[PDB]
Amino acid sequence: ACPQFDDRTKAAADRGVDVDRITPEPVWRTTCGTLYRSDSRGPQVVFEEGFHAKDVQNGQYDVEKYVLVNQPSPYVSTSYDHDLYKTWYKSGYNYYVDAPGGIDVNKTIGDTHKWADQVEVAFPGGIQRKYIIGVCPVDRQTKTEIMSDCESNPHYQPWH
Ligand SMILES: NC(=O)C1=CN([C@@H]2O[C@H](COP(=O)(O)OP(=O)(O)OC[C@H]3O[C@@H](n4cnc5c(N)ncnc54)[C@H](O)[C@@H]3O)[C@@H](O)[C@H]2O)C=CC1
Numbered sequence: 001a002c003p004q005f006d007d008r009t010k011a012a013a014d015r016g017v018d019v020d021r022i023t024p025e026p027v028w029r030t031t032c033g034t035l036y037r038s039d040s041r042g043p044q045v046v047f048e049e050g051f052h053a054k055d056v057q058n059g060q061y062d063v064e065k066y067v068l069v070n071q072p073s074p075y076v077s078t079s080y081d082h083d084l085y086k087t088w089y090k091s092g093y094n095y096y097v098d099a100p101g102g103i104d105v106n107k108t109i110g111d112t113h114k115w116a117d118q119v120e121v122a123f124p125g126g127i128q129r130k131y132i133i134g135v136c137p138v139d140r141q142t143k144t145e146i147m148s149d150c151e152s153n154p155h156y157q158p159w160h
């Protein structure tokens with residue numbers, strides 16, 4: 001149902017992430033369900049580039065510090081929660097992700113911190129475009145997906 005890979009950065013769009021720098025000790029996600037990412041960039045950009053991390057070389061490698069205060073980091077955030085997009089003022093787009101691995105944030109840093117209801121999975125080195133299923137645009141006023149205008153990613157490559 002869900003293959004496991006020894007490469008902890010299999011999903012990454014940025015190949016140069018050093019997992020030895022990750023702190024604290026990561027607990028890696030081992031399931032393969034759909035994850036979600038709000039991102040204001042539209043699909044003709046995201047489907048082409050994937051989700052690159054902001055600062056792989058010199059960003060905030062401590063997951064706890066990154067989660068508590070957004071800052072440039074080697075991580076791209078996603079959520080187990082389809083509906084997390086509703087908590088954004090301007091989500092723009094709810095991207096659907098089918099990618100192996102990632103750091104399970106609440107398993108790594110606990111589920112009592114500020115923001116634990118984001119049920120986050122942080123991808124070191126981001127998420128290459130072949131692991132992005134598609135997207136639904138989000139209507140800001142109603143905080144709902146505009147389901148008739150969802151789109152598939154032509155580069156999505158199923159792997160399980
Ligand atoms: N986005 C999500 O669905 C999730 C976010 N989080 C957390 O929620 C907070 C808000 O997250 P985001 O909006 O994702 O913050 P972010 O700072 O990663 O992205 C904000 C905006 O920056 C732009 N952007 C991001 N990465 C880029 C890149 N490499 N190149 C160019 N433009 C880029 C996009 O317009 C994006 O909407 C953060 O603390 C994040 O860790 C937690 C769970 C899921």
Ligand SMILES: Nc1nc2c(ncn2[C@@H]2O[C@H](COP(=O)(O)OP(=O)(O)O)[C@@H](O)[C@H]2O)c(=O)[nH]1
Pocket residue numbers: 066067068069070087088089090091115118
């Ligand atoms: N984990 C985490 N979440 C944050 C942080 N700042 C804001 N958020 C949450 O991320 C979601 C999006 O907030 P923000 O990035 O300000 O975008 P906006 O709602 O579109 O203006 C909201 O639920 C915020 O409460 C942060 O530093 N860390």
